[PDB]
């Protein structure tokens, strides 16, 4: 039981880190699709509306702080988060 | 029966009515066995009976501790990583004890 | 109706005056009780067509309210306890009705934090106050009041869980809380609301079925 408890603690820390990164990804996805809805305000665009309402990317308090406007630096941040 | 040693009496004589609720925390070993040794007018016979009683109690405690520990360890190994005549006696002579006269 | 903006006006007025007088330290039971009774029947359909970040900040404030009894761990101090308990349970009712009541809202009008809060709140309060007083196996009018509050909460929460997708970490807590009621005695209505909750969880996500089967099988004794 002692050995297994130790390995469990290690996995706990790993989980904390993964949880953080996933929160980051969800916030980024929501923000870029909001920008795409603003684009919808300028077929395919109603489809991306369907996307953003489909995903249910549960937002967190850290959302509004991460406001970058590039849409390409956004994509590289999203790719790194995904990796 | 009656007394702060009735549990050990039962465990040494009958042992069946003794429930899983009794055995666990009813008796504090280091106190009760200590009580047995200087108790007034204790016969050697009854003392031997009480000895077998207390040893049976202790053995049962060991059994329960092992069972609960084993349960816990089996739990901890779990995780969630989402990624016709067949046999008749020959005639009746087997069971047909005849009537007397 | 089209708008029928008179009890729409009731609730809009209540909300803006209240978060103005608070924002510029808790609202108190009366405000929450009145807002909830207007959320129930009046705002059964009237919660739509309002200001978004307004809702964001007020639900954040009543979240800060909710946190006051999450792990509260509880002849006059007892009175203080029961006051705090009814206030926070009324508040929890408020938040879980406001998140769900409309068939449609904008996205990001409900952040998972208030979700987690109301979940753990009901878990602790239920499993540490309701079962002991309702069943001698585990172990005055305020108790029945809290019981009714919890039934409303779990029903509304079942519906909310049906609407949108969620993250597994919350799901583990929700499933454990919803499996809990089937093993005490006099809780029938709570039991069937828990039926609703557990069956919604079993419907949506096709990866926790084995977990619910194990958590049923373990405690059959």
From Swiss-Prot, chain A:
Species of the source: Homo sapiens (Human)
Sequence similarity: Belongs to the SMC family. SMC3 subfamily.
Processing after translation: Ubiquitinated by the DCX(DCAF15) complex, leading to its degradation. Regulated by DSCC1, it is required for processive DNA synthesis, coupling sister chromatid cohesion establishment during S phase to DNA replication. Deacetylation by HDAC8, regulates release of the cohesin complex from chromatin.
Domain statement: The flexible SMC hinge domain, which separates the large intramolecular coiled coil regions, allows the heterotypic interaction with the corresponding domain of SMC1A or SMC1B, forming a V-shaped heterodimer. The two heads of the heterodimer are then connected by different ends of the cleavable RAD21 protein, forming a ring structure.
Residue span relative to the full protein: 196 to 974 of 1217
Disease: Cornelia de Lange syndrome 3 with or without midline brain defects: A form of Cornelia de Lange syndrome, a clinically heterogeneous developmental disorder associated with malformations affecting multiple systems. Characterized by facial dysmorphisms, abnormal hands and feet, growth delay, cognitive retardation, hirsutism, gastroesophageal dysfunction and cardiac, ophthalmologic and genitourinary anomalies. Cornelia de Lange syndrome type 3 is a mild form with absence of major structural anomalies.
Gene that this sequence comes from: SMC3
Annotated S-S bridges: none
Miscellaneous comment as given in the Swiss-Prot or TrEMBL entry: Mutated Cornelia de Lange cell lines display genomic instability and sensitivity to ionizing radiation and interstrand cross-linking agents.
Subcellular location: Nucleus; Chromosome; Chromosome, Centromere
Protein name: Structural maintenance of chromosomes protein 3
Curated annotation (Swiss-Prot), chain B:
Phosphoserine PTM positions: 37
Domain of life: Eukaryota
Post-translational modification: Cleaved by separase/ESPL1 at the onset of anaphase; this cleavage is required for sister chromatid separation and cytokinesis. Cleaved by caspase-3/CASP3 or caspase-7/CASP7 at the beginning of apoptosis.
Residue span of region Interaction with NIPBL: 84-101
Cross-link (Glycyl lysine isopeptide (Lys-Gly) (interchain with G-Cter in SUMO2)) at residue(s): 39
Tissue: Expressed in the gut (at protein level).
Similarity-based family: Belongs to the rad21 family.
Summary of subunit composition and partner proteins: Component of the cohesin complex, which consists of an SMC1A/B and SMC3 heterodimer core and 2 non-Smc subunits RAD21 and STAG1/SA1, STAG2/SA2 or STAG3/SA3. Interacts (via C-terminus) with SMC1A and (via N-terminus) with SMC3; these interactions are direct. The cohesin complex interacts with NUMA1. The cohesin complex also interacts with CDCA5, PDS5A and PDS5B; this interaction might regulate the ability of the cohesin complex to mediate sister chromatid cohesion. The interaction with PDS5B is direct and is stimulated by STAG1/SA1.
UniProt free text on domains: The C-terminal part associates with the ATPase head of SMC1A, while the N-terminal part binds to the ATPase head of SMC3.
Medical condition linked: Cornelia de Lange syndrome 4 with or without midline brain defects: A form of Cornelia de Lange syndrome, a clinically heterogeneous developmental disorder associated with malformations affecting multiple systems. It is characterized by facial dysmorphisms, abnormal hands and feet, growth delay, cognitive retardation, hirsutism, gastroesophageal dysfunction and cardiac, ophthalmologic and genitourinary anomalies.
Listed name of the protein: Double-strand-break repair protein rad21 homolog
Species in which this protein is naturally found: Homo sapiens (Human)
Span within the parent record: 10 to 171 of 631
From Swiss-Prot, chain C:
Subcellular location: Nucleus; Chromosome
Modification type Phosphoserine: residues: 5
Tissue: Widely expressed. Highly expressed in heart, skeletal muscle, fetal and adult liver, fetal and adult kidney. Expressed at intermediates level in thymus, placenta, peripheral leukocyte and small intestine. Weakly or not expressed in brain, colon, spleen and lung.
Associated pathology: Cornelia de Lange syndrome 1: A form of Cornelia de Lange syndrome, a clinically heterogeneous developmental disorder associated with malformations affecting multiple systems. Characterized by facial dysmorphisms, abnormal hands and feet, growth delay, cognitive retardation, hirsutism, gastroesophageal dysfunction and cardiac, ophthalmologic and genitourinary anomalies.
Biological role: Plays an important role in the loading of the cohesin complex on to DNA. Forms a heterodimeric complex (also known as cohesin loading complex) with MAU2/SCC4 which mediates the loading of the cohesin complex onto chromatin. Plays a role in cohesin loading at sites of DNA damage. Its recruitment to double-strand breaks (DSBs) sites occurs in a CBX3-, RNF8- and RNF168-dependent manner whereas its recruitment to UV irradiation-induced DNA damage sites occurs in a ATM-, ATR-, RNF8- and RNF168-dependent manner.
Domain notes: Contains one Pro-Xaa-Val-Xaa-Leu (PxVxL) motif, which is required for interaction with chromoshadow domains. This motif requires additional residues -7, -6, +4 and +5 of the central Val which contact the chromoshadow domain.
Family per record: Belongs to the SCC2/Nipped-B family.
Name this polypeptide is given: Nipped-B-like protein
Span covered, complete protein: 1193 to 1461 of 2804
